Every structure is written in C-alpha cells, then in structure tokens.
C-alpha cells in the first residue's frame, strides 16, 4: 500500500537512539494532559492516585514525507520504532501504563514531521500533607515530570493554554477532599547530571469535614 | 552535518563491541564512581524490619571502546542503548524487592563522553532489610543501611568509590519522615571476602531517631492518668467497698 | 417483546412549520431506535439510525433524539416530499416497529 | 509434509502484510463486531468502588488481505499468530487494572475464514470503576458500567458493533457469580460516542444492575441496634431505688451504641454524606440517650 | 446496495409459496437478512431473520413453522417460504438488510402475495 | 559420537517446524493426556472464596514431526526448547491468579521419545475460585474444583483424558490442611459448549470437611462459659441489685 | 586490541554449541557440585507455616565443550553468558515462591576455567514451606527443611553433590539473621532419592533447626494469666458482706480470662489440636471459676 511505502521510507536509515536535532538545538516538546480521575488521597502513605491521558508533541525532521496523506494515524506498533522522549514523573511512587487489550498508546505523524504521541497512565504521586489544621486542612500538591537523561540544553518542555483539562469530577474517587482547581508551572532544577526543565501541575484539594464530623466530633 | 556525523560515530562505537567483556578485560580493574540522590524514604516499619528507599542511582566508569573525538559534545542516547553496552553488575545485598521505574519509559540514562566516560543513571525504589533493636522503643535510634557491591567481579576486576566522597549522597536533609528524624549519614568503602573471592562493598547508612512526641500522648498519657485515678480509691472511705473496688479493677482492665 | 407505541396516529399540520413525532418503548431500548419513511406504494427508507443519527443523503431538517424509552423525530420545516408514513422501530432486541403515523397537509 | 501446504498458506498470508495498517485503510471503515461472555461476575469492592469481571472478550472483523484458498475453510491458529496481524486496540474506558490471563499459554484464539473474516477471543479479568451513590446504603442498587472502545482510532476509521442482537450480545454464565453481598438483576448494553480533543470515538457500554443484599447488615447492625434500644428501655420497669442499676444500664447501653456506630461506619467507604444506616444508628442512639435522660429526671 | 426482490405472486389458499430476495453489491454472508410483512395500510411487523454465514434463523414467536428463512451464499440470495397460506397472509413482504446501528438500512421493492381463489 | 548425533537429530527435528500448526493440523484431533501431582493446598480462604494449589502439571501427546529413530534413548532437552515446539493451549477457567515457578530456571520439562511422544511438565501454583456455602459453617463441607480446558481448540482439534484415570492425580492423601481434611476427590472428563464451539474439559475436584476442633475452643467454649457465668446471677442474693446488673451487662458485652 | 583475543576465544567456545543438551548427554552423568551461603535467614511465619531465606546458590559442573586455551586461566564473564550455555535447572521442592534478584542486573555469576569447569552462582530469596507441629507451642522447636534438586533430569542424567564436606557446604553468615522470635541452633544436610511420576531424582536436603523464644509469650500471655489468677484469689480475703465487690472481681476476672483466651489463639495459626499455652490458659481459667464458685457458695 501507499502508507506501507511511506512508513518503510520513514524508518529506513532511522536511528531511534538519537533525538531529533541532536547536535543542533534542544527538542521542544509540547505536553497536554487530560485528568481522567484523581483517585483516593490516602494520607497514611502520604500519596494520591491520578489517571491521566498524557500527550506529547514534538517535531522530527526525519519523519517528513510528501504525499496526499496528510497525517499517518498509527497504533502502538510504531511507538518503539521512532524516537520517543523519556518523560518521567519525578514525584511518582509508582506508575504504570495500560496494556489491555493492547498498549493504550496512539501515534500520529504529519507531513511536516510533527509527531503526536498520547498514552494512558495511572500515577501514585506522593505529596507531603501538612496535617496541621486537619481535618480542616487544605492541600495543593503537584504532579511533576521531566526528561530523565536529557538536560535543558537538549529537551525543553512547554505547556499550552488548554493543555490540562479535567473530566466530569463527579465520578472521581475523592471522598474526603474536593477539587478546587489546578494550576501549571515550569522551572529548571539543578541535578547531578545537569539542569532539567521540570513541568508541574498542582491540584488544589479542599477537605470535606462532613465525614469526620460524624466519625469523631 | 551534525546528525549524519553523530549517527556515524554511534554506529562505529557499537560495531564489534563485545558486551560480554568488561572494559580492560585482562588489565587493571575498572573504577566505578557512585552517586545517589535520595528521592525519599517512604516508610520505616518495625513489623517488617525494612524501609523503602527511592533514589537516583548513578554509576560512572571509563570505557576506552566508547571514546570519540570527531564530535565535541556529550552524547545522551536513548536508554535502550544500555542493553547493548557493558554496565557493572552492581547489586544491593540487603534489599528484599526493588524495581526500576518504567513510566513513561524505563527511567534509565546513558550518557557518553568523548574521553570514554559513561554515566549510567537509574531510578530505583528498594525495600531494604533493616533489623532493629527495640530495647529502648520508642526511645530508640536505628541505623538502617544500604549495602552496594559487585556480584560477578572481584576486586581484581572492579573497584567502587564514592564520586566526590562527601557530596556523593544528596537529599538526606530534604527527607521527611512521620516518625523519625535523620540524625546523620555515613559513606563507607570496604572490601568483603566470600569463598568465591573478594568484592568491593560500598555502604550508605542513616541514623534515625524516633520522634517521641507522638508516643507520649498516645500511650504514656493514658497510662499516667489511669495510674493516677487508681489513687482516688485512697481518698474514699473504706466503708464504701463498691466504688473503690470498681475503680481499681477497671483501671487494671484499662 | 418490546412494544413501540407511536403517537399521534395521524397529522394534518400545515406545511412549512415544525413537526414532532414521538415514539415510546415499552422497555429499555438504549439508542437502537430507527425512523423509516414510507411514501405511498413504496418500500420504507431509513431516515434515522441509532438515536439522533442521520442516514446518508437525508434532508437536514430531520433530527431525532431519545435516551431510554422516549424517542422523537423532528422536522424543521415540512416540504411537499415529506408527505409520507413514518415508522419507529427498535433493534435493541428482535425488531419491532411502531404503528406508524401518517403525515398530511391542509 | 501433510502440513507443508498449510505452512505455505500461512507464509503467503503474512508475506507482504503490514500489520501497522487497519484493514481497508483507505477504501472503507473497519467494522469490529464485539461480544462478551461473562464466565464470572467478580466480587464488588465498595471501598475501592470497583467490581471484578472475568470474560471471554470476542471481536470479529473482516480482513481482505487474509483471504485464502485451501482444503480447510477455517484456520484455527495459535494465539501467537495474532501478534503478526492487525488486531483492534480495544481498551476499557473505566478499567482500572485488567489482567490478560496467560496460564499455561496466552488465553487467546485466532480463527481465519477463507473469506477473510477473523474471530479473535481473549480471556480477561477486568477491574472497572463503578461509581456509587450510597445515600440509600445498605438498601441501594447500582448500575455498574463497563465501557470500552478503541484507542487511537476514531469513528471515521474503526467502529464497533454487537455481533448479534444487542439484548443478547452480553451473556452471563448462569453458574458464574462470585458476588457475596450483591444480586445481579441483569445487564444492559448501549452504543455511543466519546467526544475527545483527539477526535470522536465509538464507545460500547454495558451496565450490570446490582441490588445490595441486606441480610448481613440487618444481622450486624439493625438487630443489634434494636436490641440495644430495648435493653435501654427495660430500665424503666426497673426499681427507682436501684440508682446504680439504672445508671449502669444507661451508660453501658450508650457505650454499646457508640461501638456499634463506629463499627458500622467502617464497613462502607469514608463518604462525606450520611447513609440510611447512619440515620438509623443516630435515631437509635437518640432513643437510648433519651432513656438515660428520663432516668436522670426520675 | 440493492436487493432485487422477486415479483408479485398469486397463491391459492393453503398453497405454499417461495419468496426470494437477491442481494447485489454486497455479500449477504456479511450481515443479517430480515423479512418484514406490511398489511394493507398498516404498520410493519418483523417475521424473522437469517445469519447467512452461520445459517441460524430467529422468528417472531407468532411465525413458528408458518415461515422459513433460508439462504444460498453461493447464489447470494435469501428465501422466505410460508408453509400454509390463509386469508391473513394477503400482504406485502419486504426483504431488508441489517445496517449500521442494527437498523434496516436497505429494503427490497417488496412482493405482493395475495391469497385468493 | 552421541553428542554431534544428538545435536543433528534435534536440529533436523526443529528444521522446518511450524509452531503455528498442531500435530495433524488438518487431520483428526490430537489426544492430550493430563497427569497431575498435587504438591500442596496452600490456603483456603472464605474471605476471598478461593484456594491456592501447587502442583506438577504434566501433559503427554504425540507429535509425529518430533519422531526420530537414529538414537535409542528418551531425550530430555533444556526447558527453553518448549518455546520452539507446539504445546497445547491448556488453561484453568476458574483460576484468579497463577504462575509457573521460575527459580532457579523456569520449572518446565520437555521429554521427547522416539515415537514422537512429548511429555511436557510444569510446576504451577494457582489461586482458584470456589464459591463456599457457609450456611453450615463451621460444620460445613466444601467442594472446590479446578477446571482444565482448552482455549482455542475445539473437540475436533484436541481431546483431553486423564492418564491412568485413577492414578492420574497423585499426592492428595499426603496433603495436610490446618483446618480441613480431604474427604475424597474425583476426576471428570466432559465437554463444554460455548458460542465459539465445543471444547474438552477435565475437572479435578476435592471434598473438604472443616475441622471443628479449632472453632470449639475459639468460639463455642467462650460463649458457653459466658452463659455459665451469666447464670451465676441467680445464686447471688437478689437484694444486691448492682451486683447482678454488673454481671448481666458484662456477659452481654462479652 | 587486547580484547580481540578474548572475543575470539568466546566466539570459538560458543560456535556449534547446543545449550539444549547437557554435558555428556549420552556418555556419562552430569555431576553438579552444589553449595549454599545463607546471607540471611528470613523471618519464620508460623501462621503460613513457611520461612524466608536469602542465599548465594552456587553450582559447579564440568563441560568439556567449554575448554579453552588463552592468556588467562579463568574467564570471569558477564552473567548474560550463562543463558548462552547449558546450566542445570535446579529447583526447590518445597519452595512456595522464590525471587531471582536482578537489581541492578541479574545477580548471577559465571566463571569458566580453562579445563572446562564451571562456577554458576546466583542470589535468591526462597520462601519455603516448613511443616511444623505446634503442640508444645510456645516451647517448640522446628527443623525447617530446604529441599532442592533437578527438574526434568533423573538420577541417571544429573546427580547433585556437595562441594565441600556435607557438614561445611551450608554456611550461614554470622550477622545474617532476620529471626525475631526464633533461635537458629544449626543446620544439617542430607542427600537422598525422590521417586516421581516422571522418574527417579536426586534430592539435596538442608534442615535448619529453630527454637522458639518464649520471652514475648511470657510477658504477653503467662504473667497476665498468673496475675489474673492471683487477682481472682484476692477476693477470698474480702468481707463476706461485700457481695457486689466480690461479684465484680469474679465477673471481670472471667472477662480478662476470655479476652486472654481469644487473644492467645490468634498468636498462632488455626490448629485443631490444643497447645501448651492453651492448656495453661484452660487451667488458670478453671482456677478463676473455682474461686468464683467458692465465693458464690460462701
Ligand atoms: C529484572 O527482571 C524483570 C523480569 O524479567 C524485568 O522486567 C521485565 O522487563 C522487560 C524489559 O523491560 C519487560 O518487557 C517489556 O514489556 C513491555 C510491556 O511491559 C508491560 O507488559 C508486560 C507484559 O507483557 C505482556 O503484555 C504486554 C502488554 O501488551 C505485551 O506487550 C507483551 O507482548 C506481553 O503479552 C504477552 O503476555 C500476555 C499475558 O501475560 C498474553 O496474554 C499475550 O498473548 C502475550 O503472550 C508486563 O510484564 C510489564 O509489567 C512489568 O513492568 C512494569 C513497568 O512499569 C512494572 O511496573 C510491573 O510491576 C512489572 O514488573 C508491563 O505491564 C513491552 O512493551 C516491551 O516490548 C517492547 O520493547 C522491546 C524493547 O525494544 C521490544 O523488543 C519489543 O518487541 C517491544 O517493542 C515492540 O512493541 C512496542 C509496543 O509496546 C512497539 O511500540 C515497538 O515499536 C515494537 O514493535 C515492533 O515489534 C513488535 C514485536 O513485539 C512487532 O509486533 C511490531 O510490528 C514492531 O515490529 C518489553 O517486552 C517485561 O515485561 C518485564 N517483566 C516484569 C515481570 O517485570 C526487569 O526489567 C529486570 N530488571 C533489570 C534491572 O534488569
Ligand atoms: C551504622 O552501622 C554501620 C555498620 O556497623 C557503621 O559503620 C561503621 O563505621 C565505622 C566508622 O566509620 C567503621 O569503623 C572503621 O573501621 C575501619 C576498618 O579498617 C577503620 O580503618 C576506621 O578507622 C574506622 O574505625 C566500621 O568499620 C563500620 N562498620 C562496618 C561493618 O563497616 C556506621 O557507623 C553506623 N552508623 C551510621 C550513622 O551509619
Ligand atoms: C505469556 O506467555 C507467553 C507464552 O510463553 C510468553 O511468550 C514468551 O515470551 C518470552 C519473552 O519474550 C519469549 O522469550 C524470548 O524469546 C526471544 C526469542 O524469540 C528472545 O530474544 C528473548 O530474549 C526471550 O528469551 C518466549 O519465546 C515466549 N514463549 C512463547 C512460546 O510464546 C509471554 O512472554 C507471556 N507474557 C508475559 C510477559 O507474561
Ligand atoms: C464436587 O462437585 C462436582 C460438581 O458437581 C461433582 O462432580 C459431579 O460428579 C458427578 C458424579 O461423579 C457427575 O455426575 C455424573 O455425570 C455423568 C455424565 O456422563 C453420568 O454418566 C453419571 O451417571 C453421573 O450422573 C456430575 O456430572 C459432576 N458435576 C459436573 C458439573 O460435571 C463432584 O462429584 C463433587 N465432589 C467431588 C469430591 O469432586
Ligand atoms: C497553564 O500554562 C499556560 C502556559 O504557561 C498558562 O497560559 C497563560 O495564561 C495566562 C492567563 O492567565 C495568559 O495571560 C498567558 O498569556 C498564557 N501564557 C501562554 C504562553 O499562553 C496558564 O495560565 C496555565 N494555567 C494555570 C497556571 O492554571
Ligand atoms: C491531552 C489528551 C487529551 C485527550 C486524550 C484522549 N484520547 C483518547 C482516545 C480515546 C478515548 C476514548 C479517549 N481519549 C482521550 C481522553 C478523553 O478525551 N476523554 C476521556 C473524554 C489524550 C490526551
Ligand atoms: C449473629 C449476631 C448475634 C448477636 C448480635 C448482637 N450483638 C449485640 C450487641 C449488643 C446488643 C445489645 C445486642 N447484640 C446482638 C443481638 C442480636 O443480634 N440478636 C439477639 C439476634 C449480632 C449478630
Ligand atoms: C507489655 C505488657 C503490658 C501489660 C501486660 C498485662 N496484661 C495483663 C492482663 C491481666 C493482668 C491481671 C495483668 N496484665 C498485664 C501486666 C502483668 O501481667 N504484669 C506486669 C506482670 C502484658 C504485657
Ligand atoms: C559535557 O559534560 C561535562 C561533564 O563534566 C561538562 O563539564 C561539559 O561542560 C559538557 N559539555 C557540554 C558542551 O555541555
Ligand atoms: C522412556 O520412558 C518411558 C516411560 O518412562 C519408558 O517406557 C521408555 O522405555 C523410555 N525410553 C528409553 C529409551 O529408555
């Protein structure tokens, strides 16, 4: 098929070990996030669960192609063939993608080499709760992420105005907390291996005193 | 260009590369420098006699075969390359279960330098066995440790050292624990001998002191009171048997 | 056996204005209600498949809605071609059609 | 020999086959026919607000590239063949942690018909979130959903449909019911669209209607609460002069109502609102406390 | 794309009749084939359906035995045969194809089956 | 000799071997004999309504593609050969979580015979669901089963039978359970019909009778003797209202 | 390069090498010398009747195919070489669940001597079952076994043996003891034969002898029981008029006895038979009741 020929040409002479523009300029990655759910906030382990659809967009000069097909809509089969940024969540106790029935990954490539790569993730992010004022305490704690091995000189992350959007919020697992709102942030963090662009999303959570009223007051 | 040349050099580096043989297979030992960045110490448990430790575990060694001069920059490569490169078989002797984080990809770093150095980062959560002496509980201080050594390579083949020897472990100050305070930490280098040979051992140890404030109010205060009320029986006349007997015996039950 | 009650049984509403056909189902038929148009002496033609989906080459004045048991078909503005019998059928279970309602102009 | 013809057939099928492209990529829309057989409806977890379900997940679609001519009309092939061909990337919208079973070998089957039709069944244990409003607890009923659809393929490329009549397309094994405190009244299916920033996706919905059984809650909370109330009541028949007796009755009954309250609240999740059992416990507590006040007034 | 249903048939009472629905532009093996009768100036009523790939047939509980749906995948045709014909069977019989959301998207022109002497 | 000969025999056997096709792919069904050696019934929980079974699962069938005559002895090959051969897709329908033991290596066996027979063994521990009727608890007798079935192959492609039909399952008499006793067990051969076809199923079931000894001294004796204590109210003088009140309320709290 | 000679040596060793065939497959018996170094004796779970142990499992055997002549006498090779050659498939007969640690890399060792001897070590955490009778609980000793042998290889193909003297082949690190309530007295080894449905196998057995420490059970169950008995007896010295006081003594002493009886049983698994602690609790219980009956009759 035509798409088969295009995909064969794209991968021919392609080194997925090397990021785009390796010796030229930092690779600019645009990230969006759909907060499907903010799971329970259990203070005993000092963590909270969140289910998101993470999206990342960058430009790969090696993936340019000329054809009437304007976008190559692909499944997870190609995710491991092209270069993918090594984004990781810095405050995650443990996170895993979803693998049923197949890897919950999408890949779309445009004519100009732009790549869109989304995947489904559930993260047990850890954030310290200052339990002073509990159970009247209000918390606003983050979900940070960055590139593991690429400092700011090689990978730069950037948000979008409509990057972070939330679900319905009625089916969320928050029982003793209420989702006030969220804000995003970007900064540079000094690390043993260099300086990294760290992207943060803060979820403001207000406690519900109704349950603990009945329980103890 | 700066892409064709990079691809060419990386192809040359991995062509005819024997992953089975360590750098300087027949020669002197390879020197591996260790950095740790303690992301957190999640939970210290007395029942299980262990503690969980998330950290960025970095190892630096020099490999002649991975030296290049046609490009004046440090090549960070997609961590899938580590499956094609030799890396030291470091292991933690006193760990129960540990994993490398794997979202969105394996939290692993390989960085090459023109002189041949290789930086190998890993993000590891480790539940390490830490036997505790509870004679003075909850007035006790524990000494949980992490024992790092090479499995297959003896001291004729590998030597471990702390990269910096003082600022090799970072983030201990930023660590926070609900029940413990980190008094200090020490970095030790030594060699341990087994029947199979002698191996280089690094040890990272923390001094943890229990925060008594919780326990005072939680346990001692009810005890102190109950044993105070138990004295109320004295002020009551011995004629009234029921009140005094009930008070004493219920204090014993409590 | 789901019984689809279709009302009104007939209409003589004036041309050019809104028409509302309401079809009700005895049981739950999630969104598998379809609307067929049957001009005199001719086979039925599908207008709405599922609930609130239009078939290819259908005038945009036709639009349906309905969730569990209450489904309706709306025509923005009647035309001379819309003078036909309309039947609502469910496909959640073995198919059953409604009594069908006749549209007339006067 | 005796299978070299079949080996040639299979090798020809895969030859020049791109499994990165859906069947009919440019000509048409891939229509996937889905079917579920529930071999067991697992226990419902109220604290986690999820339910487990073990299913045979069956999907069928037509692949022109897999047409063949041979002595056999249907090729019953190993599961490993399924990885070499294109298969739909279905995922469960509300699935939390689902395991694909693999003992002893991957529990998957692939069947290819000479006309190109494919049947692809897999065995799964799906753990899906079932949001619940527990205002009527323990006399509450829920419609636990099981939504699923395609990741990375929009309505314009992949659409899902039920293999047979929607009412008969989700089948629950009669003997398969691992529920302890729930009753499965029935299941209901629907088909819809998911509106996403990346496009419009087809979502196939199934709702399992569960009504909670009250016997356990009766025995553990309501009958004990009524008995505590009556134990507080009997003090009125007691002698007025037995002030210690009546005081002991009242204080012990109130302590008993507190312990039942605290033990009953832990069973259900830590929801903010107040459930029916909470109101019953509160009113029983009020009755015992009023009996204590009455004794005090006497 | 089109179902070339047979022509109108005149049948004496008590005499079986075979109605054929010929499909073109698609393989009947792909989808279900339906049979619907419409009485003179009356609502439609489903008779039965056949899954040509499998060969299974389901019927309106009121048509058990009185109707028989069969297919010929080789001929790409669907047949409806009524065992016994009475005064109530003088209607118009339609052949329909299963559609997108289980809707009967394509219908045949219909056959007039009058029972008279 | 006896080494190059064996190597070339095994190489010839695996040459042009289509793992995608069962023995007699277009012919009659292949017969698979099931042999089990129960190692232990590790735990039986009413909370989770399941039990844990460790066993040696053996399967025997004939693959004429794996027939050799140039070497006279049964061949045991490294367990990794099982990945290059065809093995039946047996699965346990009612297992919630199960695994093949993998220390020091995958606990798997492949033994070939000259006639083509293949003996395929696994050490499997599986947690299987069995709904329990606790109406007569703790005096109840449970009947927990393991349902062995083929996934993708119908009765036209594969058939299951118990090798021995009485000695197919061994080790049951040796099993000891802290709170249970195995009254008996049965081996059943039948067929199950699904929408996709008819499949062969084997069922191994156990009759478990609960030991009342623990429950006596755990729940029955305390309640009985609390009732005995409660009756003591009658012997006390009826004047002492407070004493009898305390006695009765204490019994209710117990 | 200095490394080219060793690459050539390793390529010649693995050329035409079948890792599917044991050394001396047709001619002799592969004799595997075994050795264990216990880096820590994990906790012993009485409730589950199991214990955990962390070891360096050492196995040595001779492979004539791996003879080489090079500048060095021993090849200390990366553990990935172990997968390229034949290794024994040792397994633990009574192992409930084992871990082959691979942090940061497979904790395996492979040393090839110029004459073809192999040393294959690995770090394992073995959770093994230890059947244990608790009649003398808490004054009970156990000999927890650790049986291991070959899977799929009969005594006519692979036989195991201890490297050093049998009394010196299982070595326990002096600082490596994770026991809390058990005392490790020593270990004994034995070698025997096991008959299975598949053939005759060599089984290597190690017995770890454990003595339970009583201090916890002393302070938790005995002193409370003796104190309860004496507290029940104090009621004897009280006045015969103080009827409510002695009644409260009796009832709450019995309360404590029942609480101790229920709280002692959960300290050990659900065993049908009665333990020594149960007999002691029962005797103290009978004494308390005896005292109560004395008060009631007087
Ligand atoms: C110490 O030892 C540990 C134990 O060995 C070790 O952990 C193991 O690490 C390895 C490597 O890191 C893991 O292997 C990877 O797994 C990735 C997925 O991981 C998830 O899923 C697996 C289970 O795998 C099953 O399910 C997935 C999901 O779809 C399937 O992808 C698999 O095929 C497989 O399906 C089989 O099994 C099913 C049921 O069991 C059957 O029903 C089914 O029929 C199949 O038989 C889990 O094990 C993972 O859980 C673990 O990891 C998480 C990490 O967070 C932990 O949290 C958790 O606790 C567990 O520990 C996890 O859930 C794979 O994606 C990956 O494979 C890709 O990459 C490699 C490397 O490049 C390729 O070689 C490979 O071919 C794959 O690339 C192809 O596929 C991707 C799509 O994913 C494409 O984008 C890509 O382009 C490429 O496509 C090309 O090739 C295709 C061929 O595959 C071809 O079809 C295409 O057309 C195209 O040409 C890799 O296999 C392994 O899972 C770990 N296991 C465990 C137990 O941890 C640990 O690392 C060691 N530690 C150290 C320090 O060394
Ligand atoms: C926690 O426990 C560990 C282990 O017991 C303690 O490590 C010990 O540290 C001391 C002081 O650094 C070591 O003593 C040194 O011994 C060498 C031996 O040659 C000697 O040359 C030095 O002069 C020094 O005396 C000791 O060896 C070491 N223990 C082990 C087993 O290596 C640690 O100090 C404890 N506390 C903390 C906070 O880590
Ligand atoms: C589910 O069970 C299947 C059935 O065994 C597992 O398939 C097995 O997957 C392993 C791991 O990839 C395969 O081993 C690999 O072989 C390749 C060569 O083909 C080699 O390069 C790798 O290093 C590795 O050794 C194995 O062949 C394969 N077995 C078969 C017959 O399918 C599957 O892994 C299981 N899924 C999981 C991860 O739970
Ligand atoms: C545990 O429960 C299972 C499930 O009920 C019991 O298996 C049942 O065993 C009986 C007798 O062995 C089977 O009945 C037989 O059916 C054959 C069919 O050909 C018939 O010829 C015989 O005359 C007899 O009626 C029954 O089918 C079977 N249940 C199922 C679902 O297959 C088992 O006996 C129970 N106890 C133990 C210790 O396993
Ligand atoms: C999320 O990040 C984006 C980008 O950093 C923020 O977008 C800015 O929004 C403000 C409105 O308050 C505009 O005035 C700026 O021009 C926007 N910046 C850009 C680059 O478009 C957005 O505010 C952030 N959302 C938060 C913090 O909640
Ligand atoms: C940044 C971003 C935003 C949306 C997605 C996304 N991609 C899909 C594909 C399919 C389905 C069903 C849902 N997807 C969602 C999430 C969504 O829109 N929901 C849940 C309503 C991915 C990344
Ligand atoms: C199975 C069962 C048995 C007894 C209880 C129970 N627990 C209490 C606590 C306190 C008071 C006052 C009365 N209680 C009762 C009374 C009871 O339930 N009966 C009489 C049937 C609960 C469950
Ligand atoms: C750590 C601890 C604390 C208290 C006990 C304890 N539990 C009981 C129950 C009953 C009676 C009469 C006395 N008890 C005592 C105190 C005791 O017996 N001593 C001092 C000899 C046991 C362990
Ligand atoms: C490469 O890494 C070294 C590490 O010390 C650093 O000093 C140097 O500045 C880096 N070079 C560039 C061009 O960033
Ligand atoms: C193989 O094993 C079977 C059964 O154990 C036995 O009957 C047969 O003789 C063996 N073959 C050889 C060559 O020893």
Residue numbers in the entry:
A (entry chain E): 25 to 241
B (entry chain A), F (entry chain C): 7 to 260
C (entry chain L): 1 to 106
D (entry chain D), G (entry chain B): 10 to 307
E (entry chain K): 2 to 118
Provide excerpts from the study.
GABAA receptors, the ionotropic targets of the major inhibitory neurotransmitter GABA, are pentameric ligand-gated ion channels that mainly function to suppress excitability in the central nervous system. Upon GABA binding, the intrinsic ion channel opens, which in most cases enables the influx of chloride to oppose depolarization and inhibit neuronal firing. Functionally diverse ligands interact with the benzodiazepine site in the extracellular α/γ-subunit interface of the GABAA receptor. Here we obtained cryo-EM structures of the α1β2γ2 GABAA receptor in complex with GABA plus either zolpidem or DMCM, enabling visualization of the binding sites and protein interactions of these important ligands.
To investigate the structural basis for subtype-specific binding by Z-drugs, we first purified a modified α1β2γ2 GABAA-receptor construct bound with zolpidem plus GABA and reconstituted the receptor-ligand complex into lipid nanodiscs. The density for zolpidem was particularly well defined at the extracellular α/γ benzodiazepine site, which allowed us to position the ligand with confidence. Zolpidem has a T-shape, with its imidazopyridine-benzene ring axis roughly parallel to the α1-subunit Loop C, its pyridine methyl group pointing toward α1-H102, and its methylbenzene facing the complementary γ2 subunit. The dimethylacetamide arm buries deep into the subunit interface, with the carbonyl oxygen pointing out toward the tip of α1 Loop C. The imidazopyridine ring is sandwiched between two aromatic residues α1-Y210 and γ2-F77, likely forming π stacking interactions. On the α1-subunit Loop C, S205 is positioned to form a hydrogen bond (2.7 Å) with the zolpidem carbonyl group. Furthermore, T207 on the same loop forms another hydrogen bond with the imidazole nitrogen. In addition to the classical α/γ ECD site, we observed two strong densities at the β2/α1 TMD interfaces consistent with the T-shape of zolpidem. Interestingly, whereas diazepam has a third TMD-binding site at the γ2/β2 interface, no density was evident for zolpidem at this location in our EM maps. The pore conformations in the zolpidem and DMCM complex structures are in a non-conducting, desensitized state, with a closed hydrophobic gate at the base of the pore at the level of the −2' side chains. Binding of zolpidem to ECD and TMD sites does not substantially alter this pattern but shifts the equilibrium to favor the activated over resting state.
